[PDB]
Amino acid sequence: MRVGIPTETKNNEFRVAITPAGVAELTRRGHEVLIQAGAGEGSAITDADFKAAGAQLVGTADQVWADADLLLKVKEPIAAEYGRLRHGQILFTFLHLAASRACTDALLDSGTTSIAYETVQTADGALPLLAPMSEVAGRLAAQVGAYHLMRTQGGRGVLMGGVPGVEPADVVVIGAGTAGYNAARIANGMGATVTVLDINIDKLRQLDAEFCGRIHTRYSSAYELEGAVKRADLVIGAVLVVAHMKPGAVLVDITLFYCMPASVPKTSTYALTNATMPYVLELADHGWRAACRSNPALAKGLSTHEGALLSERVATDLGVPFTEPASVLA
Amino acid sequence: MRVGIPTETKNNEFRVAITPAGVAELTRRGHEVLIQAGAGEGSAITDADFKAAGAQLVGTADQVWADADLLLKVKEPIAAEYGRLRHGQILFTFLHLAASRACTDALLDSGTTSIAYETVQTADGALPLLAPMSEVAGRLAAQVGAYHLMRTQGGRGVLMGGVPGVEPADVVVIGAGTAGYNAARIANGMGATVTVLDINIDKLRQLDAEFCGRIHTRYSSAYELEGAVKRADLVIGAVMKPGAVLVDIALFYCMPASVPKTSTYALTNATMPYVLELADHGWRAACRSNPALAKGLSTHEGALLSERVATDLGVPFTEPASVL
Amino acid sequence: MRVGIPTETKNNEFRVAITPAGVAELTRRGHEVLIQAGAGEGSAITDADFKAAGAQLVGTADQVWADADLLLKVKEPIAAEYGRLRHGQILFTFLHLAASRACTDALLDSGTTSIAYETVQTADGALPLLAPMSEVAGRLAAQVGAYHLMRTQGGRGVLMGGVPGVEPADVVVIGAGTAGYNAARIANGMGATVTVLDINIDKLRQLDAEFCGRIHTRYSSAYELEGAVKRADLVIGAVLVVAHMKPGAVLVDITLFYCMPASVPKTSTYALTNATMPYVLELADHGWRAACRSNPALAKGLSTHEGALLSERVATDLGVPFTEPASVLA
Amino acid sequence: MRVGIPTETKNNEFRVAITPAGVAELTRRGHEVLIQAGAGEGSAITDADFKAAGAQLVGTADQVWADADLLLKVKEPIAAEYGRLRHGQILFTFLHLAASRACTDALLDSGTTSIAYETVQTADGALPLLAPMSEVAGRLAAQVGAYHLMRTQGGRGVLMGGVPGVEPADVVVIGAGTAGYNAARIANGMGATVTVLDINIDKLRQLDAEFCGRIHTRYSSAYELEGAVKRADLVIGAVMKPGAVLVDIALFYCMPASVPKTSTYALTNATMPYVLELADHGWRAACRSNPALAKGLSTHEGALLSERVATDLGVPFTEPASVL
Amino acid sequence: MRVGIPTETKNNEFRVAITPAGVAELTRRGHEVLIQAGAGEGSAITDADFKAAGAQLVGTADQVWADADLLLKVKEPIAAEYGRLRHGQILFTFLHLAASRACTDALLDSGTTSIAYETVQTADGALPLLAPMSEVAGRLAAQVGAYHLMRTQGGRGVLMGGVPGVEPADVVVIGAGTAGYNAARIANGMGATVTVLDINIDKLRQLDAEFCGRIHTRYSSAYELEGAVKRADLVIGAVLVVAHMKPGAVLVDITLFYCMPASVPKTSTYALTNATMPYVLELADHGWRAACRSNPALAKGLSTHEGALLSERVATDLGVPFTEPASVLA
Amino acid sequence: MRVGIPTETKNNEFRVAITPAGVAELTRRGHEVLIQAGAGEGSAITDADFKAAGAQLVGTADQVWADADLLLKVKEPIAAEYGRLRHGQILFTFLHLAASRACTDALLDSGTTSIAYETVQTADGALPLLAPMSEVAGRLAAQVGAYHLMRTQGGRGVLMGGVPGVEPADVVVIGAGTAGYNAARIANGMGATVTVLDINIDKLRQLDAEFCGRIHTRYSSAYELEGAVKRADLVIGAVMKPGAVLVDIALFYCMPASVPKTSTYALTNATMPYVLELADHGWRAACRSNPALAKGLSTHEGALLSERVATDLGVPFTEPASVL
């Protein structure tokens, strides 16, 4: 089938759903990759090497969304793309439909089959396509948190790792998840005195192991938390699905309250497309139909099909007819 | 004696010439410490700190400059500060007089004894009070270069240390010097693929030793510098492909005042020993019994003593060893 | 029962099926260990300490294979040993019968009960007795790959870790398995700039953790692969169950194409006998009979019994009557 | 010649002035090595070791002191050992004569040529034979401070490096010196949160470099020392809140003889080269062709040569360069 | 319900069943925390911050054991506390009843409901509340073992990490469990040449990974063991549910034979109360009744209830009527 | 001027006296760079590299030696190369003239100005151009010793770093020198249990510091060396039980040309600065304004200047300071 990779049109979005690496496997494996001119240009990928790997570069998004059996995207269709949604195609991308009835409706109103990146889940309840983004995000939280600590940024005026004879910043990472673990790693590498708080003692246990006790760990509690933040020069909320610190101290969620992987497209594109690669294939090969019964992880992401809503949590958050996944998969 | 420290007026300057530690060691040797209200507020040293430490918190600058037998600054007196200078006062701060004919004149026409932080020099030819600024400046370059590397800062869009399975950023530091060693250190801690360039292979060996091979080294030929700079994401000038960031420390960018809370201690921790030799024995005694301090002396009783600053502005030299 | 450890007679084979350590537990636990003179001499083990631990040193292989209830071996019997295979004994060793009908036939034609080292498997599908060999192998791939990089060896003429101001080799490890992980470890320790490629992102994830990003990881793809090898000074195929690189660059599988734990017997003997120890015991204690129903991992290795073929994959690769394992175990 | 080593009689001293290695390099240059039976038993060097190495194992001390042309000790002759001293003997050991008028007299009234381990000195002003004792002394302080930190030792009740989720211990080492560097090293390896204080910022940089930031550094102001010491669990004096432990190396505690097996080699490994220059050429030749050894010479033919030890006990000085 | 935290009265016991952290969650979550004056004072916790977090400080132990719905303790009641055991309360603490019929009887004779800290077990058979103690213990074994190596302590007279040009001690850790892993970590950090012996090759495998082969590993055997201890300057028995070494060499179990987390209360109190926190809550919230059927891990710790013995192993070790856990939980 | 580099003819030599970087910095100072076709092919520097860099690729050696005002080599002219030498030519390369009476004569009878790489010497008594060869030589010894340790190489049959649960290899490096430090470094990275021996305890401390205790150190007594060497698997001579491998760098084995791609840059990166002082000012000027270069001068206008090479072959000395 002819797969399509259109140019992300959303605001401040410079990523691309595929790399010359994935495109190269689609091609030399029996498929046709329709890539829109400049789609990857935004994350340092010209069509020069996109073609030197296999890319049926086309001029407009119209031709891309058309003749493309599988449309790989990074973000969900925006306003002007609704009139694009085909019925005989498969939309594989980040949807957050429970965040857009308008979006959800347009996918049902167009009867297109779609799979949401964020809900593809494996056995241990893991979310593979979100993992990379959490990694990119957490490492960024630190680089961004460190910069905003500059007095010029309205920060306290403290250097992440100080200098000889002078103390470094005291960084607090709330949570030892992918993001919390990656945030501490960088802040620590930059020289800050990082302490990570979690309620899960095994996560804290391995952090002690990983940095021979260099990255401090404190059992997380509302009392420990409040205590740790008072002292903190920078705090990172790495806890992913009302209280304050000192003047000049920074707060980065995932005083200057700061608030992503779009910031580093080259990186993030690869990070995600590498996680996406195996599924895009299972899709391009045997179709979303055989791809979802042969793989309950990719299936768990099914979002819509010919006016069908295949996600209860969403049909719940908005109150709409739920159409069991098992049934639309025969 | 009484030493005074006025709040810096230089726009965008957040450092202070003394910390609660210094304003506590002078107070212990029989000295009255005068500090302007709000002197170290921009570097997190409230008057409370300076106060309950033995320091006298005067209302404004006037009171500081009037009394202060020795005055401690970070930057030199700026334009609107020329009327403050006193004949019988010892000014201690970064002067860079060889950069402003206007500054030099005010101190000269002033008859003030000023000693420059940046020219103070020990035996090995080291600049003690200027070295801590190169440490901060070196670490900052990396934190900053990593920041402007973001697509949204004009940068290419590369995370310093990538993420598993995805290639890390390519950093090139030119100079195995004090600042370069700091940039590579931090850039390396961010996960980045760092390489340092230098024609001093002795420095290449200690960097090889320290980071045990993780931070790459390349003899600095103009051939490699070019090739190295062609492939990089961030190049740090501690002595280009589209979107690369070049930070130059002396997308583009060309500082220790950005992190005042950090650099105040760094500078005043180096300055402290001299501020002491000055508060106890005078500029004459101090500078007499200490050559490194002697080398910083810039002006006194109308004289301009400096073969670099003097053979710059076309002025009469004065053997600093004479006034000594 | 009297266990027997004969001298490996195969070519270039200097290993031994047991160490004074294991022999010491066989003895002071109720059994008799019949070790052939010089059996361990080949891997730095004289009979001096073999007896100082418990060893009924005997002169020839004939007496060893005879009176020995359990014959522990490292390699499969060769030409002259066929006339040795008893019917009332147990052959526990590496067989690769699917690689030798002649060998397989001789074990059936002699009606001997045997268990193959390479097919003993645990729950997570793991192969314990092969693990150590993969470790030895991978660490060797690097030491051997580094030596063959010497211009004198016909190599490019590059030192693994270069010297101050000069660049090290660029080493590529294909695969993050036991072997791939161990290969990167040594090459990295030797100073090379190693990059490991894998399709399994968790393996890459932990390699980043283990060396704080010092050992580079790149999602493995046929495009990434080809790209990585072009640059490479040395490449190690650590992928265990047609394209080229630069002149002088080395290739080591598991330009100079090089091709094992027999290379370092002292090491490998211990490596394997340590993994073998627990089973040899379960065998020597309760017999292969009770040893295989009480332990499905050791049972999964059963190969033959009194003319019986207890391994389908083998009976398949050669087309021969398959005799269900469950049945020959009552 | 023949060099002799007697068992130390100083109570609680377990070191020996020579190891099987030294008693084997002298034996190879045509020297008879006499060692008392049981000399190095308290540091794990049985007579078997000393014996099957080329050493002569005499019955007791008398035989050692009588024969020994050069005598090697660790501590100085104690009270009951004054009758042992010989006019024509070279005593080599830690003497601290400037601490005992009584000791100095026995060697003086003795006419013995004694050379002090602690005053021997090379160019850079280093004390070669005294340095290894500061390494051991530094590492011991941490092992000990970590021990007395236990509630049952009077200490507060803190594990040096805590455990995951629980805060680690706070260690403060005062002095970036040889001993301080060792304490921080070990205290840091125990998981503890270590900080070193010093007014020598050059030492602060090498500690920063070495442990790459894990061991904290703070310019030693009397202000920080206090604040630092106020928050600590264990403070090590290598130059307080309830239950804190302060170890002072020169709950409280104020040494290399505690781990004799370790420190014997450390000391005798530094001493060895000199014991050789002494056994081959004599105190005269050796001390002549080697200034560092010349600096250790303390007594000879009744003379007391030392501007520190002499201007202490009120005695006549003797130009060591004269007797040379 | 009103929870109670009494002052440990046992000998040389300076720990406390709760920290201002846990007490803070009990309070600002709907409960009343009755803490006895000075209960925490012994492990550096005054009532100053105990109240500044929420503590109904009371004068005597009598009032504490009274009006307290849940009595959190570190150690089992001693002689004078028997007359304290209420019937309408819950005793959550370390019991070791199989070590005290007197103790066991008193809990049955008082009909109190109790849950033993040491038998709360999770799915992978893990014992969470013992883990922290094993960590504290193992790290101590090393600090204590290193001190007792001092000739003054009657030891051989060897410094853990020697000094330049001179060798460090040779430390042997028997077992790679929590305690064995933590013992090696510290001894190694102190500079000793540590070698860890285990029969479980995965534990040895990860120790190699964790310290890049710096902490030596040797497959554990009675022959390897005896060999390793001969050389050893210090040995730590980290193997938790008759042979000798050199003169001056130390032995620490978990020559100077030495024989705990009470040694470092500040540490250990937090270590354990952090592990205890989640259960104390599940208890204080829904009662031991709903707390044990909703959580089979905490339930597996049930020890007694109104004259009932809810632990077979104990009723076995002493021979007493066993009263099935499932039945006393409806 | 024009500097020339001929392909090495010495059998088994794969290094080249100049890299594309050097042949690019000389070309920038107005110099014609002549390089023989295939000069750096054995070290991966095709003529393409040398070409598109500013270098003149001559057909063969004749053209190189004829023109070249300064000639750069790695090894000295061998037998069949004696007819190439020119009176008015500056030869720069490793000469070891004090090793071949025959070599010395050809340069002497030649009237050529030759400067030896190995005798060039800076203040600290360091041999700049010879040091990089000891780094390579040190790392190679370990890679090689680890290789010949294989049962199939005659070795004992030990993997350098063992495998979990199995004991690692025992490495002994004799010499804390530049080469020894490199061998221990690499041998340690291979997982091996490394120990370094030296009578210079200062070097023992930096190795202790660097690898923080993982690489063992032992004072070099002849007693320990023996005991140490008795227990080893691989001993590296950077200054035996059956199957042990002893590599000696100056089963047995007694080098930088083995990894030409690496060592060419290493040597030419050190040589480069001198090749420059030579191409710009001449052997006279260069050697004049630079003592380290002055120390390398070996022959000129028929003279043989060297108190080591001259008092070897029984020849007349010529004050190098005279011809200067």
Side-chain angles (χ1 to χ4, degrees), chain C residues 21-46:
Chain C
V23 315
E25 296 190 303
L26 296 179
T27 292
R28 287 301 178 66
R29 259 104 285 191
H31 299 294
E32 184 181 305
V33 194
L34 318 175
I35 306 182
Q36 169 183 175
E41 214 101 9
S43 52
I45 311 175
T46 50

Side-chain angles (χ1 to χ4, degrees), chain D residues 44-313:
Chain D
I45 313 302
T46 57
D47 295 334
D49 294 348
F50 281 137
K51 186 101 58 178
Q56 217 291 321
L57 295 300
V58 305
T60 65
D62 291 60
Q63 296 91 298
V64 186
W65 302 76
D67 310 73
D69 286 330
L70 184 230
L71 198 133
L72 311 173
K73 305 258 287 74
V74 176
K75 255 285 189 175
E76 78 304 313
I78 67 177
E81 303 198 62
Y82 297 147
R84 285 290 177 288
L85 311 174
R86 325 284 175 180
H87 179 204
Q89 189 179 63
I90 295 175
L91 194 68
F92 198 21
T93 187
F94 281 109
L95 293 167
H96 321 104
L97 289 183
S100 176
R101 181 173 296 284
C103 196
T104 321
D105 303 354
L107 292 173
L108 239 39
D109 307 329
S110 171
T112 180
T113 307
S114 64
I115 323 187
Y117 282 165
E118 76 282 349
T119 323
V120 174
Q121 185 173 304
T122 65
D124 49 295
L127 298 170
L129 316 180
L130 201 65
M133 308 307 262
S134 293
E135 327 199 75
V136 180
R139 308 201 178 183
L140 253 175
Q143 301 192 175
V144 160
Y147 193 76
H148 293 207
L149 249 187
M150 290 172 104
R151 179 59 186 64
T152 64
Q153 284 299 307
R156 197 178 173 70
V158 191
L159 186 55
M160 285 296 270
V163 295
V166 171
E167 167 174 49
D170 214 64
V171 179
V172 179
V173 178
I174 313 177
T178 289
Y181 162 75
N182 285 273
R185 157 95 87 107
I186 300 312
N188 191 59
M190 295 178 80
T193 300
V194 170
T195 303
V196 172
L197 300 153
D198 215 89
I199 65 176
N200 193 136
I201 309 168
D202 307 274
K203 288 170 169 180
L204 297 197
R205 282 174 202 110
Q206 51 145 42
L207 280 147
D208 169 61
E210 296 188 80
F211 307 88
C212 212
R214 187 157 167 175
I215 284 185
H216 311 293
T217 54
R218 235 56 107 209
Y219 181 55
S220 192
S221 324
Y223 189 71
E224 237 317 301
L225 188 56
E226 166 167 10
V229 169
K230 267 198 174 185
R231 269 30 278 304
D233 280 302
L234 200 217
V235 317
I236 305 183
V239 62
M240 292 182 80
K241 58 156 56 184
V245 175
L246 164 277
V247 193
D248 187 353
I249 147 178
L251 198 169
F252 254 37
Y253 192 47
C254 309
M255 175 181 249
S258 299
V259 290
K261 207 299 177 297
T262 296
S263 47
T264 283
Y265 285 94
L267 172 57
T268 63
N269 280 336
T271 282
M272 193 168 307
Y274 301 90
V275 171
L276 287 168
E277 219 72 45
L278 291 159
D280 307 318
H281 321 290
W283 73 273
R284 34 206 304 296
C287 284
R288 130 73 218 297
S289 59
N290 189 182
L293 222 181
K295 291 143 183 51
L297 265 174
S298 295
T299 72
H300 177 222
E301 280 189 57
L304 177 280
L305 50 170
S306 186
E307 68 83 62
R308 232 306 282 187
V309 172
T311 65
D312 257 67
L313 314 154

Side-chain angles (χ1 to χ4, degrees), chain E residues 73-224:
Chain E
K73 270 179 73 70
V74 176
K75 226 60 180 178
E76 70 286 320
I78 58 172
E81 302 189 300
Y82 285 19
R84 280 282 170 62
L85 299 174
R86 286 175 39 182
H87 182 282
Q89 76 167 182
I90 312 171
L91 188 57
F92 195 30
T93 179
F94 268 123
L95 301 177
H96 298 61
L97 293 187
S100 177
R101 185 183 304 287
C103 183
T104 319
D105 280 54
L107 282 300
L108 295 176
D109 295 320
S110 292
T112 190
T113 317
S114 70
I115 301 177
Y117 279 165
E118 75 292 336
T119 59
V120 176
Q121 203 180 193
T122 57
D124 52 5
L127 302 171
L129 314 185
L130 147 156
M133 299 301 105
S134 288
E135 298 176 358
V136 174
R139 300 164 95 90
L140 289 176
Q143 313 203 314
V144 182
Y147 184 94
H148 286 62
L149 259 170
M150 302 199 295
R151 181 54 194 64
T152 54
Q153 300 311 298
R156 187 179 174 80
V158 159
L159 180 69
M160 281 291 256
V163 299
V166 182
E167 45 159 3
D170 174 72
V171 179
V172 188
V173 179
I174 318 292
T178 300
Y181 155 72
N182 280 271
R185 161 92 92 90
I186 304 291
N188 163 71
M190 296 175 80
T193 295
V194 174
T195 309
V196 180
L197 284 60
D198 208 302
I199 52 290
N200 185 166
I201 304 177
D202 300 326
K203 299 166 185 145
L204 295 198
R205 200 114 57 197
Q206 53 175 290
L207 235 56
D208 198 65
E210 303 202 66
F211 308 83
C212 264
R214 188 174 191 168
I215 289 180
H216 292 157
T217 56
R218 224 84 173 289
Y219 176 71
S220 183
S221 162
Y223 180 78
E224 180 63 77

Side-chain angles (χ1 to χ4, degrees), chain F residues 87-168:
Chain F
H87 179 204
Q89 189 179 63
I90 295 175
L91 194 68
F92 198 21
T93 187
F94 281 109
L95 293 167
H96 321 104
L97 289 183
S100 176
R101 181 173 296 284
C103 196
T104 321
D105 303 354
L107 292 173
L108 239 39
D109 307 329
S110 171
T112 180
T113 307
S114 64
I115 323 187
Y117 282 165
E118 76 282 349
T119 323
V120 174
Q121 185 173 304
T122 65
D124 49 295
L127 298 170
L129 316 180
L130 201 65
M133 308 307 262
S134 293
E135 327 199 75
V136 180
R139 308 201 178 183
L140 253 175
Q143 301 192 175
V144 160
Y147 193 76
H148 293 207
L149 249 187
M150 290 172 104
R151 179 59 186 64
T152 64
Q153 284 299 307
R156 197 178 173 70
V158 191
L159 186 55
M160 285 296 270
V163 295
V166 171
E167 167 174 49

